[PDB]
Design a protein around this ligand. Sequence first.
Ligand SMILES: Cc1cn(C[C@H](N)C(=O)O)c(=O)n(Cc2ccsc2C(=O)O)c1=O
Ligand SMILES: Cc1cn(C[C@H](N)C(=O)O)c(=O)n(Cc2ccsc2C(=O)O)c1=O
Ligand SMILES: [Br-]
Lengths: 251, 251
Amino acid sequence: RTLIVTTILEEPYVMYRKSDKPLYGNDRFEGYCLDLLKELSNILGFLYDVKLVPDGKYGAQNDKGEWNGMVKELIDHRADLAVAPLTITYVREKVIDFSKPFMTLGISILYRKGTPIDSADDLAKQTKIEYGAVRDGSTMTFFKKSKISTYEKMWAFMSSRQQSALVKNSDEGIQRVLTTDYALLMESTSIEYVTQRNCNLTQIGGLIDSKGYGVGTPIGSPYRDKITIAILQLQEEGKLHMMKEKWWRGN
Amino acid sequence: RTLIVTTILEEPYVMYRKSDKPLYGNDRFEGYCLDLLKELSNILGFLYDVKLVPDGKYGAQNDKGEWNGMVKELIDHRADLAVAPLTITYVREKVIDFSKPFMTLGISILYRKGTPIDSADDLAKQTKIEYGAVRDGSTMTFFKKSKISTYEKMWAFMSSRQQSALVKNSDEGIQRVLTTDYALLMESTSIEYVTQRNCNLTQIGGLIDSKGYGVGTPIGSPYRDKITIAILQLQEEGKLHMMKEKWWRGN
Ligand SMILES: Cc1cn(C[C@H](N)C(=O)O)c(=O)n(Cc2ccsc2C(=O)O)c1=O
Ligand SMILES: Cc1cn(C[C@H](N)C(=O)O)c(=O)n(Cc2ccsc2C(=O)O)c1=O
Ligand SMILES: [Br-]
């Protein structure tokens, strides 16, 4: 069985290689997730074929309980594995299985260096410095659903200054940080990626929530536990660390 | 079925309550893991009986491939679950199953506030400041097995200054930090716990490795996936955050 692997274009996890060389199949891609998949394929001994998810989505549910994205590919048995920056969540675990996480992360703060600011509590109580998140993204939703008083304050501040504090995407938010007095709340993984490439920018404080990216499989898949095993081996042998450094390290 | 839960005395996860009131069974204990277990017991609907592991050990293997600690309790079917600060590792996954992690952590640096020191790379290249770990503990072993050049340098420095840099236990190491020019490499969870209670001490840099604590079960247990589900619900609903703050927050 050649395993069909669903994934999604997302830098630096999955990208088309910058080459016009005759590269076919899996060879057309590169990135953290491609390196992970090679390691998994060597530990477990499976052949695989990478297929980008046709609708370009991660996976969310509608009211009929209909799914889309990589999640739907697994539900329909069109893919055997999903290897992507795909968050392990309660709702998704209802319909697919996940390996244990190959990467842990959480919401954090992107801001300029040299400022007395040290946490979200420092941002919350003031207003001279604007702070927000990408509109309708995982980070905005966390704040909106939060019942922790300090994040409740941060939300009301975002949603009131709605038109200005909530950016359209990460690019815009990053632009806003460099060009004005603004702090972007985003996934720690993304922040590390930007800070490595922008010496004017830095991460503020620690992690605001916690979640992991895991390899998705259909419910009952005999590969899920094997992939957890392989992930633990890679972590313990320092290979996940080097794979992250390979793709994250900047100039 | 009343589930038998193995666990281990370890502050602030599991402690005897400071009371001479007539408390029996599970009521004799308190701590993060007791609160987690109550939440799990309410989400899943199970009765349980907490039993401290008789040999007081987490779980390690000997040459005959014989295990001890909470791991051995699960292997022998004397316990249905292990709920403790028990790290999910490749070797243990060979003999027991684990839920996904309820807490993520990694090795980090405990040091005084106000010093220009910002990471392990800052410690590695110098020698005016001693730095080490608890002798024969998980953190020492990581450095000893490491193939990352910068941690290879940190190890040779520890193992040469062996008699002085490698402390006997966390208490001693913490004492060494407060009373001399020394930095202790220890689990981030433990560091946060100390820093909350010692305003003279602080965490340096980020996480050096990554691992999680999970609930252990025998291989094949029908409770493992249910516990992962409950854990994700608790995380997403901010309950793991509040349980951690309850036990970690200092004066
Ligand atoms: C790499 C990556 C994947 N994903 C998809 C997400 N992990 C998922 O599984 O649906 C994501 O939401 N963000 C964060 C994000 C993207 C647009 S807004 C936003 C946020 O953090 O709010 C990412 O950075
Ligand atoms: C709470 C806790 C559990 N454990 C046990 C460990 N999680 C295990 O699963 O065996 C541990 O090794 N440390 C760290 C530790 C203890 C003595 S030395 C040391 C270290 O970090 O080297 C802890 O702080
Ligand atoms: Br799992």
